[PDB]
Design an enzyme around this catalytic site. Sequence first.
Site, PDB file in Angstrom:
ATOM      1  CD  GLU A 149       4.389  -2.334   8.205  1.00 51.94           C
ATOM      2  OE1 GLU A 149       5.549  -3.835   7.745  1.00 51.94           O
ATOM      3  OE2 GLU A 149       4.739  -1.464   7.480  1.00 51.94           O
ATOM      4  CG  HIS A 175      -0.125   0.116   2.432  1.00 51.24           C
ATOM      5  ND1 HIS A 175       0.232   1.117   2.860  1.00 51.24           N
ATOM      6  CD2 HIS A 175       0.170  -0.910   3.180  1.00 51.24           C
ATOM      7  CE1 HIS A 175       0.880   1.244   4.681  1.00 51.24           C
ATOM      8  NE2 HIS A 175       0.901   0.101   4.619  1.00 51.24           N
ATOM      9  NE  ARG A 181      -0.631   0.544   7.755  1.00 50.56           N
ATOM     10  CZ  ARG A 181      -0.412   0.111   8.739  1.00 50.56           C
ATOM     11  NH1 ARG A 181      -1.325  -0.022   9.117  1.00 50.56           N
ATOM     12  NH2 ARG A 181       0.281   0.308   9.304  1.00 50.56           N
ATOM     13  CG  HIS A 194       0.833  -4.123   5.837  1.00 52.50           C
ATOM     14  ND1 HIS A 194       0.706  -2.317   6.023  1.00 52.50           N
ATOM     15  CD2 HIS A 194       0.129  -4.867   6.021  1.00 52.50           C
ATOM     16  CE1 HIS A 194      -1.010  -2.918   6.160  1.00 52.50           C
ATOM     17  NE2 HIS A 194      -1.213  -4.530   6.196  1.00 52.50           N
TER      18      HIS A 194
END
Lengths: 243, 246
Positions: A89, A11, A62, A184
């Site tokens: 992440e 992202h 996200r 991520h």
Amino acid sequence: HMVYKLVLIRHGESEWNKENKFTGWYDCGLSETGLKEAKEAGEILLKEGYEFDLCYTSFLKRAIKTLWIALETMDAMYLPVVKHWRLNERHYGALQGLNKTQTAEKHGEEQVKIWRRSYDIPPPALEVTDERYPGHERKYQGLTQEELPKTESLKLTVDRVLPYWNDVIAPSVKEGKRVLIAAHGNSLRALVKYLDNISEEEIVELNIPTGVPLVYELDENLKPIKHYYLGDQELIQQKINSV
Amino acid sequence: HHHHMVYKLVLIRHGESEWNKENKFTGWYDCGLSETGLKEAKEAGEILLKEGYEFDLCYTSFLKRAIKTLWIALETMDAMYLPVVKHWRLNERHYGALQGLNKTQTAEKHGEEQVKIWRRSYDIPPPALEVTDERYPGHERKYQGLTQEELPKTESLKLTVDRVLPYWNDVIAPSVKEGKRVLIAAHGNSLRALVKYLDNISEEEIVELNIPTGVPLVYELDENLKPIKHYYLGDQELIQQKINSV
Ligand SMILES: [Cl-]
């Protein structure tokens, strides 16, 4: 001999990126630029003829929003989506929410650099009573105490991601499902470290560009044959070489 | 005697679509939401938050106006991580060869009365698509898993019920009985099919049922999934205004 294609998307800019805060598992949204990049990645995939059967993403919005925007752009919103915290992440421990500049002024630039870029030295840990401890979130209600991170190094992120690749994602790829993973920086680094057998010394130097589809061609044993980024290679190289 | 359970099932009909705005028959045509439909999905999420509703599992159709409604609702509720299952059996009723035609055009082609019969009947389907018509769903990659008998050329409400209820019985109802708090984002006629089954509604009554768009519809179900009661969430006077003017 079989060839499978696997596509990865990191992202783009998050709200907290823009605000110069350590994020980790904090669940912030995309910035306007991150939203733009998700659509750009979808347009590239559509232009280049990529078709998917199954999508994976994390529990962090996200990455989820990046996938949803890409699917909307590709007119593929009906596709099955599987979301899992093991694609999250890297957890940033007690740095989560802190300003990176203030943190470096407080604890030293080199110490923060170690926390950001070391393979095996984690940031300081949360206590379970901290507001930021993931055990307090309903979304992580299914996790055992051993699974709930107080902090992670890249090493610990790899240890968390790879079981999900081995037990869930890889069998789907071997079934012939064309997989897209939206996740991520550190969880995608963990994946490619395994696929390409990357040393600890090299993986800490690898910078996966944001908003750029990364394609792996895998043989019948899911061993990589080749990989490449989709898009303008000059612009991709600039995205790579910026930090 | 047995142990009492109360399960809560929440249904959302998507808001105004772009083709709604253009007064076109839609059916399985995969159009997007209008600006008003986008707003309604956010409003539904806000009411669910206000009224204390949390979810464990979501279902929607293959049609993006319903999927987008769910995604907006989940974003509004900060529940984007929840598992989502999408399935064509929750699709809107198929409108056959009327899909894409303007409602006023169709009155020209066929007459006001015949159009009302196709709109309001229980089991009189509109004109059928040929398999050579670009609108035939066999042409879409999304439907390549369907058999020839499953690909609709046209649907009445009856045929929609016949398509939806196996999915309820085989997939959704077991999830509800497991205790998963289910949210279904779908369409006028596929939600009519569910409530026709849940409340054992007659053919005569079900064709008069107008589910308002963007208004959460809650079913309380007992341990055997028999309804205890159902209700809409929000300002009841406003909800009745919307239902009445439709
Ligand atoms: Cl989804």
